[PDB]
Symmetry: D2
Subunit: 461 residues, 4 copies
């Protein structure tokens, strides 16, 4: 009813869809569990329906590369719509085709290594802020909740690198600026609202015409004016805003004032919970594998003796650091899937893909596939040693996606976390508590996030 006949025709296997719901009832255990099970039951490819919407999973690295890289421009340029977005229609991660291509161009030079290297001293300052607060909770032997302290850090780093605003959000939890921003939390695509959207995507236009937006009308309205104040306070009298302001001082067609705001917002949304979540997954791994934590602290003390301040260059110097981070991202690729809409009838690597189908790469499951990874469930940073790193297919390991539409904030994200990890590990050790969920259970929900929030003992070195 009525496109539920598609994959049966094409010869592609898959779970049988119920009328209207398609296969969504199978998300009761989460995106990730659904995806592993399918991959095991059905093989290298399979199909399922999010409501009426046909989704084609693929697991062949060649075929993955064709979608994400080769035929990105021609065919697989956009992601799937997901709900009423109002003006956030112009955010880069949401935009489509030529508007996207334009925005990606105007915004790429913002994420170069040159710009990033300038942003280092800023991101650093809040490392120290992170430490002082951590210590206050280490001196009072009270088990620490990672996401909050990391949240406050991620928040602190975002505010400063995007707008110049400098706040201790942990101690200023109630700053109007800190407030709005913390409501920019990841979207739970299996919460009642979005599941309804899936069964009733014909309801999205209805919601749009009522100016209802999955980005709360208020947080947005606060930042719009906030920016249009900053914009007009800097003008005239180092951050993403500035870089964007300088850019509309001319693809092409510049950057409109409202366009600029939407990017500003999408970066917060992109960097905030992600940076904080990943830092938590890492700290958890580091606490449940005390040797890894020790090795890392020794690597750090070697590169930066006397607890020397980390620098851009010293960060990229640290290899085990890079290993620890990568392996965590294998275990917890917070995007879970990559997706592209098929805009044309095509044939890639011998398979016909009809227009309109959503093509999906199941990153979580691929990251834990036995056929590529020895002891996949196990946390083993050595997989990423300069020795073994060559035996890792870049289209099986894709925490940041691949191709022209991969994570634009990748370099920034990695640099951010690593700066945090270094300054923190220079100072503290992190130990499980009786109350620490071991082994960490993943949310049965729609985000990659722990079933129970990570809590750990923190002692001063």
């Amino acid at each position: 009813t009525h496109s539920h006949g598609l994959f049966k025709k094409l010869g592609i296997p898959g779970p049988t869809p119920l009328p209207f719901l398609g296969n969504i009832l199978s998300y009761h255990k989460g995106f990730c569990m659904f995806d592993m099970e399918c991959h095991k039951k059905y093989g290298k490819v399979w199909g399922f329906y999010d409501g009426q919407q046909p989704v084609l999973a693929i697991t062949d690295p060649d075929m993955i590369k064709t979608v994400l890289v080769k035929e990105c421009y021609s065919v697989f340029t956009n992601r799937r719509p997901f709900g009423p977005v109002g003006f956030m229609k112009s955010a880069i991660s949401i935009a489509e085709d030529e508007e996207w291509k334009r925005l990606r161009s105007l915004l790429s030079p913002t994420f170069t290594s040159g710009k990033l290297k300038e942003m280092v001293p800023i991101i650093a300052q809040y490392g120290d802020v992170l430490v002082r607060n951590l210590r206050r909770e280490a001196e009072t032997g009270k088990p620490v909740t990672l996401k909050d302290v990391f949240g406050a850090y991620s928040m602190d780093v975002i505010t400063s690198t995007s707008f110049g605003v400098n706040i201790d959000s942990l101690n200023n939890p109630q700053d109007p600026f800190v407030e709005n921003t913390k409501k920019l939390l990841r979207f739970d695509f299996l919460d009642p609202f979005f599941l309804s959207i899936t069964v009733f995507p014909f309801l999205i236009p209805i919601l749009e015409v009522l100016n209802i937006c999955v980005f709360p009308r208020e947080v947005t309205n606060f930042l719009r004016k906030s920016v249009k104040r900053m914009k007009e306070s800097r003008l005239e009298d180092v951050d993403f805003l500035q870089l964007m302001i300088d850019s509309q001082n001319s693809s092409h067609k510049a950057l409109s004032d409202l366009e600029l705001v939407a990017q500003s917002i999408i970066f917060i949304f992109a960097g905030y919970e992600t940076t904080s979540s990943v830092l938590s997954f890492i700290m958890y791994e580091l606490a449940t594998h005390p040797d890894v934590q020790q090795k890392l602290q020794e690597e750090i003390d070697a590169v930066l003796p006397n607890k020397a301040p980390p620098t851009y260059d010293t960060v990229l110097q640290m290899e085990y650091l890079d290993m620890v981070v990568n392996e965590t991202l294998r275990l917890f690729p917070i995007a879970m899937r990559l997706e592209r809409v098929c805009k044309k009838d095509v044939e890639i690597n011998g398979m016909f893909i009809p227009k309109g189908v959503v093509v999906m790469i199941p990153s979580y499951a691929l990251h834990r596939d036995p056929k590529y990874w020895t002891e996949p469930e196990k946390f083993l940073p050595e997989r990423f040693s300069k020795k073994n790193k060559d035996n890792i297919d870049p289209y099986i390991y894709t925490p940041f996606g691949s191709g022209p539409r991969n994570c634009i904030g990748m370099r920034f994200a990695l640099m951010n976390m690593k700066l945090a990890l270094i300054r923190v590990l220079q100072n503290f050790s992190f130990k499980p508590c009786k109350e620490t969920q071991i082994p960490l259970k993943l949310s049965l929900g729609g985000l990659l996030q722990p079933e129970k929030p990570v809590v750990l003992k923190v002692e001063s070195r």
Copy 2:
């Protein structure tokens, strides 16, 4: 298209409706302006369409009494639906027919004079809090914004009379409890969202099935658990909650746990912005009529010499106080209209009213009708002197409605404000500022509220 033919048939006059919109474009100057104009152009009765929905305005006191009192139970029992309400369907002001009749019964004894007289010492304590904060801004000769300081007061009084929670919300603007509650602001029925609802009332069910609610899912979810904590902290170990808890210790059928929560919420919503708004309109009048302010302070010093603490009995003693308050409510009846749905074909005072029509009383306009009020625009408390008070028809002056479905918090509202006014006027005088909007312009929007927020000098007596 298609019921736009109704009033033409019945012989009832009114503005010509555009297809789909009915007459709503005529709200560009606001509910109140629309209503005065119609009353003048069309007479004692008229009709118009909120979208497809037929609305019948009436201005005859007999006919008003039949609707609000005589035929309340039989015919005119409910108000008009207005949007997706989810579980707030059970709030008393929203409920219908027998469920309403039941809730009104379970909740009436809560608002008796006996209960109210017990609540006095509590409401008082925050009078003093109001004073201390006011003084801090009087000692620093900085023009004061009424709604905030009154808001904080209204908020303080609500929290304490409904849940026991005691907070200085002005100095604790960032208490989690103070936060959620301040988002319970009056609904702007001419904002884009609600106007859309009017043209598309067929969209309300759609929104309901998506669990979208005009009461933010979060504020509600916070209070639901907050109550279910309090409930289980008091149980077992003077406020509305308690009174409601004691009541479900048995109309009939008790009060369900979720029912109780919805009342709790609706009271905040009812009392919060209203109490604060009305106090602001009064203080404004008192500043732009310095003699009234002086007379009032003299009345107060006579009843409570040496600035004696006000009491339940001393409050009802004060007649000019009561006059000042009533006249303000004439000028600014914050409900603006009263409404009832016609549930049956009926004939009242010689007029046929078909099923489904919304019957509306235009209180604002009636409060300013020349044919009942000499110099209606003028602020003249003497209209309400025990001498003249008899010449005022109770179905022309209806700040609190009338009948079985009138404002349940009337006595409480009046007592609250008066306690505030007394303690404040015992201590301060209130003087216009250069920046004070004189004469106050009303919002062209959908709430009765000043175009520009009231700001006034405050000096210590």
Copy 3:
């Protein structure tokens, strides 16, 4: 999601509902099969969900009588809404509460035995027409399709008893009047359109505002003017129209012109396919039980020798006729279920029934319950002999419902069929063909109708 918790709470058993769909996937084998299975699996009562909509099945005769008779006015007055109906909102079978009560009053005297006895000679004339056409197909030994020849008859009888229009619809299949009317076919509540309505009842208002109607806008528009012609051709210069016209020559409030049209339409819809279907089920039984057919012809020849024309009085004289008809209706009660909406919280025969629930009586299943009927599947007219007829509970056998809201055209329906059967059986015998589906399979769909259309040999006596 979200009322799917209802019956679990109340202690009422039933199939587990899927999110959104409720239990509708269980209609794949049809209303009737679903109902028998439930009754067997769950007992005397059970619950299920048509989408979100709670349905409570009941099988206790006392409890059935309370719903259909005792508390009809107070509680169980209306049927469930089913789709966009536009002006057909005023048809009696669709109307609600007091409007219904009014229409039932204005239209009841139309269906008295006195009026019916006047309509006899008319319904007769088309008996003879039925015979002549039948003979043309008996003389050409060509197997006859019952529903068509009966259809043409039912159609002929409707046209004449409701509007005076006299046509041989079988030989005039292409008369504009015959055309429109044949499109008034029973609604398939398990066809894609209505199932969608069930999952999305929030879409009915949307469809209404687009003037989309399950009664085709054209058939209706043709009859509206047709009537308003007839009305004004008779006025001024014996049928339902006339009876209705005389009635608005004055409950109360008369009958509006549009109200009259809607009744006219609903009668066609009620009588057309029903009369024709039932006549087919009977003729089928009579052919697969040749003795019953013989006995019946002998009863008929006894009462009306020399093939005397049947009369009102001679029809009610015939007992085996009445037996044959009743038993057929037991086996094929074309309504399948009876339903009432619960308009109030009530308790009937010891069970609480909350407001809003649909209360359903599963007539088909009850008609085939072992615990009341020996060899239920078997066609045995003797069950209805004046001897055994007393052992049949009127709230288990309900082909026409019961109570104030039972089939208004019952007497007419029975009289119509019997007149047909008599004139036909006076003349022909009816014999199975090689192509006759034996045993008749019921539609797995939403109407009570044969899987394969009944076809039988017809020979001249």
Copy 4:
């Protein structure tokens, strides 16, 4: 609300839009009147809103050519969506981009002059049928209704040229095949249904998921099987079907079975009412200008003496015929407007056109613009004399559109009408009646069609 700000920004003039409705209330006098008025009030370009949807009218021949010809492929490839179309999504006139380009390719060779020249003897046979029936009404001096007799002809020609089915639809008005087909009438885009679609285009997806289709589910379902019978009766044992069947005996990708059906349907819909309407407008002109009618009959008798049967070659021989036809099409271009959706930000002839805008050419108004046409309202075939025909801009006179997406059935349409006109005028003269609407008033509605149906005396030569 919310795109109603577009043209104000761009500097493009136009009527002020009401909230939600845009400018649609201005269609009360019809598309054509609205368009002339705008062109006069606002100049060479202007804008208006069909609901939220921005429409840009243009009248410069260069700019028109860029849209219809130059940038057809790149930018202006599709027409505007208009409603729920279900499987008719695949009809060529409805399809988009590459699917359209494909269908246009597969179907073009069907409309060559070679194929058309083969179809001539067929279209002829029904000329004679047209004559015989006409004569029956000429011999009984009873004023004739053109559209019916022409309708029957158009219908007869369609059936035969597309499926081989040969019927006298005028005398067989009640052939099942003739029936379904006559319900394929032009869509009234100002009827209640489509206007609603315009204010609520967000309702189209809702309607689609309910399988509701502006092409009646039944007519379509009858033709689908009809074709799939014919298909399998011809296979195996000269018309469009055959030409299409031979084509899927292989752009590319052939023609699916369902694709073929949708074309079949769209041709009926395209040719039926159009051919019949245009023939009526011409016959009307010919009756209200008796000299033109005489000249034409003399031209015809010169080319085909003794009433010789017309042939493909003799038809193209006749110049005044071609003149008469063209001028009629100037006066009544039954498409009224041409439209293309702007799929990209572009700049054509110095004007920026943003993505999403509908670009509209107002053919009716252009055909009656004083600045190109002397006495535009007057019917003057000499405008099209081989002398003056050169002074006519092909992008001002566009009865069939222009460019890659122009009327594919143009040659066929012209040939059809002319064959009809010749055979008819060889035999009859056509004279106004007392009841003939002179001067013909156009429908204030949404189709180009006479306010009152054309009726004329017909006498035998």
